[PDB]
């Protein structure tokens, strides 16, 4: 039995499940420590990274957190594993580079001062939300509607067929509202607008939100037919448009504006079905 490990490289915390399970802060630093032995740390490819301290932030950062997680998840008798790697949806545009880095490769590194090594046999890279907000066994579309960018992740026949980015976001909607307001004699900038709508200093008609939603959907159309997928709208712009999104002619969909999360144990059970 090839051992399996799940690692979720989240923006706030990292979680892992192998022989052992754990969670640690996604903070990292490379700052020099005069008492290195008092810290969680990895040394890989000449870089010493302190784990769980420093700041929330890179290729070398993911590698540091991943290698640390794998050293914690399994003892040194484990020489190779199949890996399920869960990433925030925006970072899914790194999948191709990560597979080439990891699949079939051995890694030598120092873990809290101890030489360790781990080989990645097979590998699955999937967006956070796996096994908790969407299921694959398999036509899923995650639309992250951000301030400046739409990130699209399409999982078809249970594998990623597309990641795409579009330069359209709430920033553009607030730029349209700003224009209208200043034409009334105001002198706002874009960053003022959101808070002024919230507290009523700027009134916005439901028609304006509907038009902006239609611009988003038309920008997405060249890339993906949302009717054909189980579609999850996420991101802060999905919050702004929730009530209008829920009125759209889409069969299987959902609005979850906050970052998607995965039950790492649920992700492990799904992974055992893939490889065992």
State how far the Cα of 121 lies from the Cα of 234, in Å rounded to an integer. 32
| DSSP states along 140-188 | EEEEEE-SS-EEEEEEETTEEEEEEEES--HHHHHHHHHHHHHTTT---
Query: Smallest Cα–Cα separation from 85: which of 126, 142, 137?
Result: 126
What domains appear along the chain, each with residue ranges and CATH number?
3-130+261-275 (3.30.420.40), 140-255 (3.30.420.40)
State the Cα angle at 152 between 147 and 157, rounded to 5°.
Answer: 160
Report the half-sphere exposure of 43 (CA within 13 A, side-chain side): 11
Would you say how long the chain is, in residues?
276
Tokens of 98: 């990560």
Q: What is the DSSP letter of 37?
A: G
Alpha-carbon distance values, 175 to 35, 89, 204 (Å): 51, 26, 13
Beta pairing, strands 159-166 & 150-156: antiparallel
H, E, C per residue of 198-243: HHCCCCCCHHHHHHHHHHHHHHHCCCCCHHHCEEEEECHHHHHCHH
State how far the Cα of 97 lies from the Cα of 81, in Å rounded to an integer. 19
Terminal C-alpha separation, the chain: 8
b/e sequence 122-131, b meaning 16+ C-beta within 10 Å: bbbbbbbbbb
Resolution in A: 1.7
State how far the Cα of 61 lies from the Cα of 59, in Å rounded to an integer. 5
> Coil, helix or strand for 68?
helix
Tokens of 61: 């950062």
Residue 276: Cβ-neighbour burial (10 angstroms; 0-12, 13-18, 19+): exposed
Q: What is the DSSP letter of 256?
A: -
């Amino acid at each position: 039995g090839m051992k399996i490990t799940v690692v979720d490289l989240g923006n706030i915390n990292v979680k892992y499940v192998g022989e052992n399970k754990g969670r640690f802060s996604s903070k990292i630093t490379n700052d020099y420590q005069s008492y290195e032995e008092g810290f969680q740390r990895v040394e890989y490819n000449g870089i010493k990274t302190y784990i769980g301290v420093g700041e929330l932030s890179a290729d070398r950062d993911y590698m540091a957190q991943l290698l640390y997680s794998l050293a914690k998840a399994n003892t040194a008798d484990t020489k190779e594993i199949n890996l399920t790697l869960l990433l925030p949806i925006i970072q899914m545009k790194n999948k191709t580079r990560l597979i080439e880095t990891l699949k079939g490769e051995n890694f030598k590194f120092k873990f809290n001062g101890i030489d360790r090594e781990i080989k990645i046999n097979d590998l699955m890279v999937l967006p956070e939300g796996y096994a908790s907000y969407y299921s694959l066994d398999g036509d899923v579309c995650i639309l992250d509607l951000g301030s400046r960018t739409i990130n699209i992740c399409v999982l078809e026949n249970a594998k990623i067929v597309k990641t795409n980015t579009i330069k359209l976001g709430s920033f553009d909607f607030y730029s349209k509202i700003k224009s209208l307001e200043n034409a009334k004699g105001e002198d706002y900038i874009e960053e003022d607008i959101q808070d002024l709508i919230d507290n009523g200093l700027i009134k916005v008609d439901s028609k304006q939100y509907i038009e902006f939603l239609s611009d988003i959907l038309n920008a997405v159309d060249p890339y993906v037919d949302l009717k054909t997928y189980n579609t999850i709208f996420t991101g802060g712009t999905s919050l702004m448009l929730k009530e209008y999104i829920e009125k759209l002619p889409l069969n299987k969909f959902k609005v979850h504006p906050n970052a998607l999360t995965s039950n790492v144990d649920g992700a492990m059970e799904a992974s055992k079905k893939v490889w065992n």
